[PDB]
Amino acid sequence: AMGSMERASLIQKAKLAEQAERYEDMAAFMKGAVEKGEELSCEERNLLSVAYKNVVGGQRAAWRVLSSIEQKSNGPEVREYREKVETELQGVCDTVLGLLDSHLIKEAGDAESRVFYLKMKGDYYRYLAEVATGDDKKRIIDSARSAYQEAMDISKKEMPPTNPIRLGLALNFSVFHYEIANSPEEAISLAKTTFDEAMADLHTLSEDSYKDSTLIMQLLRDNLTLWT
């Protein structure tokens, strides 16, 4: 749909859409930019991720409201509307996963880009898992786990323990273990080890990098406080 707009114009409009809090537009501009076929810079990857996290975040919040109403009620309206929101959410997750598969991941050779995209892949399978039931749920859960694990393996070999993408990946994989995989001990162990190894590497950082790393470390600590 964005085929006639220049790549640079799509990027500029995605930044404007963010300022205007128009996240659906932002995601559509960034989808258009990905479909130009060129790799994304660090800032462009962040725009893609921010756009879709906002879109799916609002869908997830709505799905949770409707699922709670439906569970309390247990006419067809609540289930029908929860199903409509669920299908829309699944469609957005499938769209992001399709961008990652065609062809962002395969072209990502540097650790920073490949880890970022595999973390995204884990996240969007995790959002699919949140609404999945039964056996479909098992394969979706394993797809999230596999993406996160590959990202973890690369991150531990190629990035310092304070790298913000490495830290956010570990945070989100710990949430996966706690909330999706029914592995709270694995969640706690990953969050603790990640926090401690980052603490021991803070001395190497500038003041600005210190601020970025400690912000995510606080999120790990916030979860550990809630889980223990």
């Binding site: 725009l47 991720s49 956010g168 989100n172 909330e179 995510i216 979860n223 809630l226």
Partner: peptide, 9 residues
């Protein structure tokens, strides 16, 4: 449990 908010560039 909180994941990365990730909603502001």
């Amino acid at each position: 449990a909180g994941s990365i908010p990730g909603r502001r560039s």
